[PDB]
Structure formats: structure tokens, C-alpha cells
């Protein structure tokens, strides 16, 4: 097999409570091993392994380099966030809900954004919890998610099963019924 050498540099922003707490961590990676890092919490570069030692020592010795990395959390993170607030964080795509048999009843909740979602089963107006198991939240890669929420049942006469779904995109919760 062929040989390969990989270098990664990641400028990551971390946001919490809107824009109250913002943290920048620039990361340098040599083949899956982070070697140098700038973390706005710290305020200067820090080697993270020996390989990253000369790099951090040199970069830290430059008053103008640190000057600019300390400003980065404002120049890059807070700036982009404003654009995110007007677009990406506004994306609301509504779930489409479907019931189907696999003794199992699967409630498919597909194509939504963002990720927050609550799916509850009912049997005849009573909530079912003990007999429910979800798949993990599945990321489609296309800026939507999906999730499958299964329910164990044995169908009796006059039984109505209800999938109940809550999502930021919906003013009112979606309900889909299914009959024996």
C-alpha cells in the first residue's frame, strides 16, 4: 500500500448562549496528532506534543502574531456568527412523519433541521414509553436529519396508535394515526 503525509489546520469557533461566550481554538494536526494549538481561553500558542514545540516558541515570540490571533475571536467568530444568525440558524425544515410495520410499528420522522426533536408514541390516548426504542439521530449530509422511532405492540380491535412529534419548525405538533 502507498504512503501518505497529512497536515490539517482547523480554525474552530465555539458559541454558547447566543454570543455571550465565544471561544476560538486554532488547531494544527500532523497525521491525526494535534501538535500546536491557539486557544483564546489561554491567549497564546501551546505545544501539545513535542513536534509542536518549535512552532509554538517561534509564533509566541512574535508580538504582532499574538496580537492578531487574540483579535481573531472577534474578527472571524463573532463576525461570521452575525451572518449565521440571518441564515443558517434560521433554517427550519419541517419533519415528514410516516407510520409503517417493520411485531413492530416504525414511526419515520425524516428530512428535518435543526436537530432538536421529540417523538412520542401513544396507544389509545395513553403514552407508551417502556416499549419504545429509537435509532440514533441520523445525519443525512444534506443539511437535514432523520430518525426512526419503533414501538412494540400486539394489535387489538379498535386500537389507535399515535406518533407525536415536536420540532422548532412546527407551531403545532404533528400527529399521525395508524389503525389495526
Amino acid at each position: 500500500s502507498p504512503e501518505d503525509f497529512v497536515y490539517q489546520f482547523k480554525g474552530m469557533c465555539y458559541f454558547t448562549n447566543g454570543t455571550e461566550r465565544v471561544r476560538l481554538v486554532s488547531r494544527s494536526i500532523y497525521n491525526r496528532e494535534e501538535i500546536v494549538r491557539f486557544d483564546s481561553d489561554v491567549g497564546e500558542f501551546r505545544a501539545v506534543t513535542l513536534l509542536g514545540l518549535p512552532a509554538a516558541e517561534y509564533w509566541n515570540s512574535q508580538k504582532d502574531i499574538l496580537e492578531r490571533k487574540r483579535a481573531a475571536v472577534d474578527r472571524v467568530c463573532r463576525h461570521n456568527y452575525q451572518l449565521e444568525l440571518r441564515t443558517t440558524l434560521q433554517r427550519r425544515v419541517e419533519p415528514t412523519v410516516t407510520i409503517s410495520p417493520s411485531n413492530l410499528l416504525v414511526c419515520s420522522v425524516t428530512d428535518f433541521y435543526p436537530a432538536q426533536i421529540k417523538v412520542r408514541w401513544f396507544r389509545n390516548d395513553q403514552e407508551e414509553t417502556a416499549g419504545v426504542v429509537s435509532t440514533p439521530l441520523i445525519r443525512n449530509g444534506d443539511w437535514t436529519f432523520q430518525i426512526l422511532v419503533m414501538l412494540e405492540m400486539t394489535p387489538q380491535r379498535g386500537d389507535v396508535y399515535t406518533c407525536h412529534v415536536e420540532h422548532p419548525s412546527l407551531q403545532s405538533p404533528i400527529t399521525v394515526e395508524w389503525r389495526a
Binding site: 500500500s1 502507498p2 504512503e3 501518505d4 503525509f5 497529512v6 497536515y7 490539517q8 489546520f9 482547523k10 480554525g11 474552530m12 469557533c13 465555539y14 458559541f15 454558547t16 448562549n17 471561544r23 481554538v25 494544527s28 494536526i29 500532523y30 497525521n31 491525526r32 496528532e33 494535534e34 501538535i35 513536534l51 518549535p54 472571524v76 467568530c77 461570521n80 451572518l83 449565521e84 441564515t87 443558517t88 440558524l89 434560521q90 433554517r91 415528514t96 410516516t98 409503517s100 419515520s108 425524516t110 428530512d111 435543526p114 436537530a115 441520523i138 445525519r139 443525512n140 449530509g141 444534506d142 443539511w143 437535514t144 432523520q146
Partner: protein, 182 residues
């Protein structure tokens, strides 16, 4: 490992000796906002709404140049310590619940990719499929491996099946993940 409401990569900058090749992309909450076409000096947005914004593709090329230099310094300094081949992790599922004759999309998820070199192709009943096929860039993970997602468009039909075909150095023989409608 850091806990936040939202996490961005306003720079996933990648360079590798093999090829050689590069990649430049922005991610937000785990999805690709855009990548830059380095051979074309062109910004390609991956979420429609974001086409209203600008981003100069030139500077992505510049960034890759820096990386290219640094990689050379570290190959020298690490006594030529080369990347380790992982075994990729494959899954195939559909975007929507399956209805015969109703348009769907097959998703091929390829996880734990390292190094970022892989061939992902599709097979219908043993033949290969060319059209309806697209894929994401390499997306980053916190453990510094990548994942990549391949898509195929189709009308599901009974007795018509698909294989998602993955080739990686961490793989002894190419891997095939099967999908039946059922």
C-alpha cells in the same frame, strides 16, 4: 471535547503528500457550508441560502500553500512518520421511506476515514451506476479522521438492488454494502 451550543470550523484546511491534493471547506454544526474548488479558484456553496455571501477563493489557495510548507518541515522533523491506515466504517440507508416508483435518494455513509483517500462508487445488480451520483467533501471529526457521504438518485423497484462500493488502504479487498427495498 469542548461543550457549546454551536460549533463552527471557519477553516478546515487540508493538505496531503499523496497526489498531492488539498481541500478547503467551512463546516457549521457538522454540515458543509461550502468548499473551494482549488483548481478553479471558485467558491461552491453547499447550502443554497449562503449564496448571498462572498468568500474570496484566492486565500484558500494561499492557506494550502502555508500547509504545504509546514508539512514538509514536519516530515523532516518527524523522521518521515507516515499516516496510519484506519478501517473505514460503511452504512447505506435511504433519505425517505421507500415507495416503489416514487423518487428517493440512497445515502452511503463512510466513516473513520484516514488518510483522506477513498474511492466510493455504486453497483446496480452487478453493473456500475454513473448518473444520479454526487458526494460531499471530506468532513472533519474531532479525532481528526474524516467521513464522506455518497448519494445516488433512484426510483425504487422490486427485484432491483444496489451495492455501495468502497476502496481504502485500510481495506484488504474493496467493501460492498448492500441495499434492498423491502
Amino acid at each position: 471535547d469542548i461543550v457549546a451550543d454551536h460549533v463552527a470550523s471557519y477553516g478546515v484546511n487540508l493538505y496531503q503528500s499523496y497526489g498531492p491534493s488539498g481541500q478547503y471547506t467551512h463546516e457549521f454544526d457538522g454540515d458543509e457550508q461550502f468548499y473551494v474548488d482549488l483548481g478553479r479558484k471558485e467558491t461552491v456553496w453547499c447550502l443554497p441560502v449562503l449564496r448571498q455571501f462572498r468568500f474570496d477563493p484566492q486565500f484558500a489557495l494561499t492557506n494550502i500553500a502555508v500547509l504545504k510548507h509546514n508539512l514538509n518541515s514536519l516530515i523532516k522533523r518527524s523522521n518521515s512518520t507516515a499516516a496510519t491506515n484506519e478501517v473505514p466504517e460503511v452504512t447505506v440507508f435511504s433519505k425517505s421511506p421507500v415507495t416503489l416508483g416514487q423518487p428517493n435518494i440512497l445515502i452511503c455513509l463512510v466513516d473513520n476515514i484516514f488518510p483522506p483517500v477513498v474511492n466510493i462508487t455504486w453497483l446496480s445488480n452487478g453493473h456500475s451506476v454513473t448518473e444520479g451520483v454526487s458526494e460531499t467533501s471530506f468532513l472533519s471529526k474531532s479525532d481528526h479522521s474524516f467521513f464522506k457521504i455518497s448519494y445516488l438518485t433512484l426510483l425504487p423497484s422490486a427485484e432491483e438492488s444496489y451495492d455501495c462500493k468502497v476502496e481504502h488502504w485500510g481495506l484488504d479487498k474493496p467493501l460492498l454494502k448492500h441495499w434492498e427495498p423491502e
